[PDB]
Structure formats: structure tokens, C-alpha cells
């Protein structure tokens, strides 16, 4: 594939997804926490996100990529460790941007988990 591209990472309290994509929008590959034998509680841990990120970085290095753009969209605790995984997995980083769905104080969110 193209040497350039963007790696995107999204996180929800019980899900993580990471996708390597062309700069135009079309993806080249993607993985998630449920792709492995850690579905559920073990997939809310940074380990699942790190392994998924390493898997996508490795499979896009085989597909062809280099120093990548960083698009994080979400409010997960592993949104910083995923970038470290990208950096150490060969898909090194130079800059990082925010595509997060962070809302300026708005409308009703879902019910309260407690």
C-alpha cells in the first residue's frame, strides 16, 4: 500500500477498535478487542487494545506503511498507551491529532452506571 496513511484508535468503556487507513478515508485494515480470546472483562483492559494495535501495525507494515498520522477518537483510558504501541510496533509516530467525539456541554447522555 501507500507509505503514508493514518492509524485511528477508538475506545468506549467496553470496546477498543484500531484501524490503519489511507489518508483519503478508506481503511486498509482494522481490528478490535473482541477479535481475540479476551472478549468482555479482559477486553476492557489496556492489554487487549495494545495487542490489537500491534496486530494492525504489523499487518499494515506487511501491507506497506511508514511514519503515520495519529487520529484518536474517543474517551478511553488506553488512548495514550495505544499511541505508544504504534510507536514501538514499527509504525512510528511524529505528530498526533484529535478526532474525538468530545461534546461541548450538550444534551442528555445515557443512564448512570454505578
Amino acid at each position: 500500500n501507500v507509505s503514508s496513511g493514518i492509524i485511528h484508535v477508538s475506545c468506549s468503556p467496553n470496546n477498543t477498535i484500531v484501524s490503519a487507513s489511507d489518508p483519503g478515508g478508506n481503511v486498509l485494515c482494522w481490528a478490535s478487542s473482541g477479535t481475540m480470546g479476551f472478549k468482555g472483562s479482559r477486553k476492557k483492559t489496556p492489554y487487549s487494545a495494545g495487542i490489537a494495535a500491534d496486530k494492525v501495525a504489523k499487518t499494515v507494515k506487511e501491507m506497506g506503511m511508514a511514519t503515520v498520522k495519529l487520529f484518536v477518537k474517543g474517551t478511553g483510558r488506553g488512548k495514550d498507551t495505544a499511541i505508544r504501541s504504534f510507536a514501538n510496533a514499527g509504525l512510528s509516530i511524529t505528530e498526533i491529532n484529535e478526532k474525538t467525539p468530545i461534546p461541548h456541554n450538550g444534551c442528555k447522555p445515557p443512564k448512570r452506571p454505578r
Partner: protein, 65 residues
């Protein structure tokens, strides 16, 4: 570190002391609270209004640097 009672202009508006307004504005497009600015807070609340206007005027981004 006040920038409007110190300058003595005492006149706050959109564009006449923008750098003074930004003195309380972090590069992160976020304004420091009273416990950090530590000023008379007439000028700090004027900064609040002016820089929220600037965000509305797209001088500084909402969520960006």
C-alpha cells in the same frame, strides 16, 4: 498577573487589548481559573467573555491548540 488593572486601560472590548486577554489564555485555547490568574476578576471575567467570543469568532479553536 493581571493585564488590565496593571495596564490601567480599564476598557475591555473585542479588539483593543487582545494580547492582554490572551495572557490569561493558555496555548491550549483554555483560560486559567481564578486560583491561577489571581487578579481582580473583573478583568478576568471580561477575559472569559472576550475569549469565549473569540472561540465564537474562531480566533482560537474550541478543542485544539
Amino acid at each position: 498577573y493581571c493585564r488590565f488593572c496593571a495596564i490601567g486601560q480599564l476598557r475591555i472590548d473585542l479588539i483593543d487589548d487582545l494580547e492582554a486577554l490572551k495572557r490569561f489564555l493558555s496555548p491550549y485555547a483554555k483560560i486559567n481559573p481564578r486560583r491561577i490568574t489571581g487578579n481582580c476578576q473583573m478583568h478576568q471575567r471580561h477575559v472569559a467573555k472576550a475569549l469565549k467570543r473569540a472561540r465564537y469568532l474562531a480566533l482560537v479553536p474550541f478543542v485544539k491548540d
